[PDB]
DNA sequence: GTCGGA
């Protein structure tokens, strides 16, 4: 997962997590309005610190000083809990990135066709993220990654990997600072939303170019 | 110390 839509108001997403969570984030009624959220930008990220929830703009990408290559944007759930690189993020930098759905590109030959993937029941998604804390320091190299998992069922037909999406109840547990890395691994294993809860459709190729914006990017298209 | 298009 390297592109998604986060277009609604923050209250719209937070209300699915809990009554209290929505009250605990300062009021900002503006729809986030982003139909083409791309790595290397700052993205509103939900987390907990000092027993309080926070929604901060955080760089999507992770590139510590000692990392000579371009920023990572994903971390594999298979190994992130024990990775030399991601272990500290799994333990102390868990977060949630909400979204309306995400884009995946199917490589039908030498070209790519984008699909928008969303919950069949019309709810937004909560993607599991890990990152560098303190998140609020506006670091532009040490941000967050979206945790990935193996594509299951029909998603396998689009791409071999997928974001780890948590149910709202799991998303709330994921963010708790007092839990073990092992508890987090069990939340990730127990709270993942399987492919049969999603629908998807092809969308215009225009989304691939980050310059393109607007609700059209997620509309279904005929020709593929 | 690892994994999107353009």
Author numbering: 2 to 225
From the article:
The replication-associated AP site repair protein HMCES protects cells from strand breaks, inhibits mutagenic translesion synthesis, and participates in repair of interstrand DNA cross-links derived from AP sites by forming a stable thiazolidine DNA–protein cross-link (DPC) to AP sites in single-stranded DNA (ssDNA). HMCES contains a catalytic SRAP (SOS Response Associated Peptidase) domain that is conserved across all domains of life. HMCES SRAP is similar in both sequence (29% identity/43% similarity) and structure to Escherichia coli (E. coli) YedK, with the highest degree of conservation within the DNA-binding channel and at the active site. An invariant cysteine at amino acid position 2 (Cys2) constitutes the extreme N-terminus after aminopeptidase removal of Met1 (18, 33) and is required for DPC formation in vivo and in vitro.
